[PDB]
Symmetry: T
Amino acid sequence: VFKKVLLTGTSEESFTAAADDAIDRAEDTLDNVVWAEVVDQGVEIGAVEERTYQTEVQVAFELD
Amino acid sequence: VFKKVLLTGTSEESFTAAADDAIDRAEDTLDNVVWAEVVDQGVEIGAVEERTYQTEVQVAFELD
Amino acid sequence: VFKKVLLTGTSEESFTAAADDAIDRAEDTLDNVVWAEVVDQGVEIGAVEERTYQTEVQVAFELD
Amino acid sequence: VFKKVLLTGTSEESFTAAADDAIDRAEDTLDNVVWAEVVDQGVEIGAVEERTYQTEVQVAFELD
Amino acid sequence: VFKKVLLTGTSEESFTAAADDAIDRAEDTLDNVVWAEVVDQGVEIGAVEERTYQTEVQVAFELD
Amino acid sequence: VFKKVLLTGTSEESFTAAADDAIDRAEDTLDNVVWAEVVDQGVEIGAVEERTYQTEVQVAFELD
Amino acid sequence: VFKKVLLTGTSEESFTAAADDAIDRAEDTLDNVVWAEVVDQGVEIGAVEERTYQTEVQVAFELD
Amino acid sequence: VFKKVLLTGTSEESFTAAADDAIDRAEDTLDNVVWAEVVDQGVEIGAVEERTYQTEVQVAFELD
Amino acid sequence: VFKKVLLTGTSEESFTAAADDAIDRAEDTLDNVVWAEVVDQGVEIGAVEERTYQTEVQVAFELD
Amino acid sequence: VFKKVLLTGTSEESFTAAADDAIDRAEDTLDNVVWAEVVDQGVEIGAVEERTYQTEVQVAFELD
Amino acid sequence: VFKKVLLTGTSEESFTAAADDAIDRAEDTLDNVVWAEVVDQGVEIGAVEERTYQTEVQVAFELD
Amino acid sequence: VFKKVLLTGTSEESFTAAADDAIDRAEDTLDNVVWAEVVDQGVEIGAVEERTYQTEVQVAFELD
Ligand SMILES: Cc1cc2nc3c(=O)[nH]c(=O)nc-3n(C[C@H](O)[C@H](O)[C@H](O)CO)c2cc1C
Ligand SMILES: Cc1cc2nc3c(=O)[nH]c(=O)nc-3n(C[C@H](O)[C@H](O)[C@H](O)CO)c2cc1C
Ligand SMILES: Cc1cc2nc3c(=O)[nH]c(=O)nc-3n(C[C@H](O)[C@H](O)[C@H](O)CO)c2cc1C
Ligand SMILES: Cc1cc2nc3c(=O)[nH]c(=O)nc-3n(C[C@H](O)[C@H](O)[C@H](O)CO)c2cc1C
Ligand SMILES: Cc1cc2nc3c(=O)[nH]c(=O)nc-3n(C[C@H](O)[C@H](O)[C@H](O)CO)c2cc1C
Ligand SMILES: Cc1cc2nc3c(=O)[nH]c(=O)nc-3n(C[C@H](O)[C@H](O)[C@H](O)CO)c2cc1C
Ligand SMILES: Cc1cc2nc3c(=O)[nH]c(=O)nc-3n(C[C@H](O)[C@H](O)[C@H](O)CO)c2cc1C
Ligand SMILES: Cc1cc2nc3c(=O)[nH]c(=O)nc-3n(C[C@H](O)[C@H](O)[C@H](O)CO)c2cc1C
Ligand SMILES: Cc1cc2nc3c(=O)[nH]c(=O)nc-3n(C[C@H](O)[C@H](O)[C@H](O)CO)c2cc1C
Ligand SMILES: Cc1cc2nc3c(=O)[nH]c(=O)nc-3n(C[C@H](O)[C@H](O)[C@H](O)CO)c2cc1C
Ligand SMILES: Cc1cc2nc3c(=O)[nH]c(=O)nc-3n(C[C@H](O)[C@H](O)[C@H](O)CO)c2cc1C
Ligand SMILES: Cc1cc2nc3c(=O)[nH]c(=O)nc-3n(C[C@H](O)[C@H](O)[C@H](O)CO)c2cc1C
Ligand SMILES: [Cl-]
Ligand SMILES: [Cl-]
Ligand SMILES: [Cl-]
Ligand SMILES: [Cl-]
Ligand SMILES: [Mg+2]
Ligand SMILES: [Mg+2]
Ligand SMILES: [Mg+2]
Ligand SMILES: [Mg+2]
Ligand SMILES: [Mg+2]
Ligand SMILES: [Mg+2]
Ligand SMILES: [Mg+2]
Ligand SMILES: [Mg+2]
Ligand SMILES: [Mg+2]
Ligand SMILES: [Mg+2]
Ligand SMILES: [Mg+2]
Ligand SMILES: [Mg+2]
Ligand SMILES: [Mg+2]
Ligand SMILES: [Mg+2]
Ligand SMILES: [Mg+2]
Ligand SMILES: [Mg+2]
Ligand SMILES: [Mg+2]
Ligand SMILES: [Mg+2]
Ligand SMILES: [Mg+2]
Ligand SMILES: [Mg+2]
Ligand SMILES: [Mg+2]
Ligand SMILES: [Mg+2]
Ligand SMILES: [Mg+2]
Ligand SMILES: [Mg+2]
Ligand code: NA
Ligand code: NA
Ligand code: NA
Ligand code: NA
């Protein structure tokens, strides 16, 4: 059985790095992270010093 | 990093109040709730005394 | 077996009340109305005296 | 010919009132506003004093 | 309030049995599982001995 | 001209049999049922003795 | 209150004429047909003498 | 950079001609119109003398 | 078993004729073309002498 | 690099077996079939002796 | 009230840089640009010297 | 007439480079590749040495 958690990563560099940011967080607290599916991307502009890229992923991990 | 939990709030009054019901629950058990996105709305009719409005939200909260 | 009918309710007050308007109509002519799913919302503005909120629902009822 | 503008209204009270907020703004600056279609709803929580309901609408107006 | 968890069940027999596999897992660790919604189905072919059917479900459970 | 009715079939056995349940019902009351399109699947769990599979279909029938 | 019926019109000439075919049928049996929304288009090729264009519409009519 | 405007054209003749109606309007007031994407089609029936076909397009134009 | 190929037809006349253009091409090189499903429509404007209507279809053909 | 082909399998027994029918066909003519994603399901009723279940899959295979 | 404009940025380097290209343009002519949502990505290949990445964004800005 | 093939490119570096990987493959075996549309992105994590970014594209090429 796989379970997914819906995480939004951020990065001041790129959409790819914002995906990695979410995946890094999942791997910090979850065992057996197997894949991620991009479900949304955006950019925070007027509440941040630099533009922040965001990539939202469903991060899948195998249960047990 | 933001994480979302997928909650359905209920209310006998309105769709807005059913959204608040889910958000209240998230704020009970989660720190740093930042926003909610409506993903579905419905009404329970024939298993309840009064019509119950339901609003399903992805409730986003900042990790750490 | 459940069947759905696709109804748009209207109200000069709110989206919730426009949903109720469609559900009321379904309950007038159908037995065993069990639930409704919101599929669209809109507002009629320039052909009405007051803004009219509209909520379109799939209203489910149990057959037999 | 109709044209649509994509507006997000806000309200501290309800999703219906947040729709009205966007429609009010369209009627301030546009002639012949005829209808609005709800395309999204959400709630701002952790950057506001009170929860703020948001309703995003495509507001249609007749050209000429 | 209902909460959903996004689980992918697997089975070497059928899509229905892969749904049951996810639901079984939810019932192992969650109280008050009330319903599941199918959101995706697939088949793993070239990394398994036998084809494995997969059914991804949002499994809803009542909070409290 | 074809018309569709939106029916949810149920079964304690499988998604396929729940589709048949809706189609059987359509064929009971309609002439010239030609095809069905699956639009949703789910499982009722916590209000039934046994899990009940549900398959929602648009059942198409030729008018005249 | 508006209700919609989901009809597929056919024509050997065009998608527009296939829409009219469904609308004609609705106007034959329904009072107060107000609008139609195109939801799908297709072409039947290998079971017909000539290609047949099909346009599927939700045909809306005002109740009462 | 391209920008899109969301226009609904109308015609008493066809969906193609309703698309042209929106595109004509865009070309009246915009320079460098490059393409259009159909996003919706419908028919106005019960508020017009003759059925009116409508085609909604995102009309893209190159900025500068 | 049916297979689909994803083709975009073009025409200087209409969306229907652009669908036929793709279907003609499929029938040139494929046996047993049975149906087509419209998946997108658009208009090329600023790189062509005359506006070109485009209709994208999944063209289904029976294998064997 | 993976490539997908869009196949509809059929079966007089079940949706799972109709998926297998498409996958079998892909494995007949393609090397390195790795997975399939269900994209649609339906039932042919009024042109067949027995109801025929259909499952449409994107069948993925590794190139080279 | 927020308003969105639908812009496609281009870049010969990356999808992230194509998003920035659209956002830069919005910030050139609009005050209070607050966020952008990615709605599509593509690559222009056979009408350009080098591949051009494109990222289409809804760019949101606060009115007033 | 344009035809599309549905390819998933991979890269250990970025989503943009994974798109290029699919496009490179299409240009290896196809003449007149004109554009690509991103339809999905993901990351393979727990079956690879390094995270692998994947970008799925519909790659369009002109027939003849
Ligand atoms: C993808 C994305 C979507 C956003 N959507 C909203 C929104 O709908 N409403 C909103 O108030 N702020 C939104 N924001 C945040 C906005 O940019 C700003 O930080 C907040 O408005 C401050 O309260 C969004 C930010 C991002 C990156
Ligand atoms: C939005 C919504 C969707 C529902 N969908 C279903 C359904 O698909 N099948 C079902 O058995 N009950 C459904 N119900 C519950 C139904 O109204 C009733 O309470 C149950 O059927 C009792 O078992 C739904 C209720 C709501 C509010
Ligand atoms: C949600 C919604 C969508 C509508 N869409 C259309 C449309 O696409 N075309 C149209 O002519 N009128 C549309 N109208 C009606 C419009 O506001 C006006 O009453 C009619 O144009 C009068 O013929 C719509 C109204 C609502 C509430
Ligand atoms: C519907 C909605 C969606 C939002 N989405 C985002 C988002 O994707 N990323 C983000 O940083 N903030 C988002 N926000 C804003 C967030 O709540 C907060 O105000 C900002 O993060 C401050 O920078 C959103 C707000 C709303 C109301
Ligand atoms: C529904 C489904 C979707 C999949 N999608 C992907 C994918 O996008 N990329 C991938 O590398 N593997 C995918 N796989 C796994 C693939 O079949 C194989 O096991 C892995 O490629 C091994 O690394 C998928 C498997 C299933 C069942
Ligand atoms: C596919 C599916 C969806 C459902 N969705 C809802 C829902 O949104 N809200 C709800 O109260 N019950 C829902 N139910 C019914 C739920 O399981 C239970 O029977 C009712 O909550 C009893 O009132 C659903 C059941 C099914 C099978
Ligand atoms: C838009 C459209 C979709 C169709 N889809 C299917 C299908 O999924 N399966 C099928 O057997 N026939 C389908 N057909 C019918 C097919 O062309 C042929 O008439 C039947 O296969 C005969 O049994 C479709 C026809 C049209 C116009
Ligand atoms: C595509 C389309 C959608 C429409 N949707 C609506 C609607 O949701 N509600 C409505 O009142 N009128 C709608 N209308 C307008 C309706 O036909 C009639 O002109 C108005 O109801 C008059 O107020 C629509 C018209 C078209 C062409
Ligand atoms: C439906 C449609 C969509 C198009 N989308 C794009 C696009 O996203 N980017 C682009 O550069 N050109 C696009 N074009 C082509 C554009 O009109 C023009 O021919 C090219 O920009 C020349 O390089 C599109 C054309 C059509 C018909
Ligand atoms: C999923 C599915 C969808 C279909 N859609 C259509 C359709 O849109 N139009 C049609 O003529 N036949 C359709 N058919 C075929 C229909 O049942 C019948 O075999 C044909 O109408 C014979 O020409 C479909 C069949 C299936 C299984
Ligand atoms: C995302 C994207 C989508 C496009 N879609 C189309 C299309 O549907 N039809 C078309 O003629 N050109 C399209 N083009 C443009 C195509 O690559 C080429 O520049 C034009 O065909 C020249 O007229 C598209 C380009 C991009 C980047
Ligand atoms: C976007 C993406 C989606 C995937 N989906 C699935 C899936 O649904 N089921 C699965 O078994 N593996 C999936 N995988 C593959 C998974 O990560 C792992 O390699 C396989 O499970 C090994 O059999 C996917 C991989 C990617 C990159
Ligand atoms: Cl989710
Ligand atoms: Cl828009
Ligand atoms: Cl329907
Ligand atoms: Cl495809
Ligand atoms: Mg930096
Ligand atoms: Mg988002
Ligand atoms: Mg009360
Ligand atoms: Mg729901
Ligand atoms: Mg009042
Ligand atoms: Mg509507
Ligand atoms: Mg107040
Ligand atoms: Mg939003
Ligand atoms: Mg076995
Ligand atoms: Mg999946
Ligand atoms: Mg049994
Ligand atoms: Mg459902
Ligand atoms: Mg003729
Ligand atoms: Mg169809
Ligand atoms: Mg005329
Ligand atoms: Mg519309
Ligand atoms: Mg001509
Ligand atoms: Mg297109
Ligand atoms: Mg048998
Ligand atoms: Mg289908
Ligand atoms: Mg360079
Ligand atoms: Mg695009
Ligand atoms: Mg490297
Ligand atoms: Mg994918
Ligand atoms: Na989730
Ligand atoms: Na219906
Ligand atoms: Na817009
Ligand atoms: Na394809």
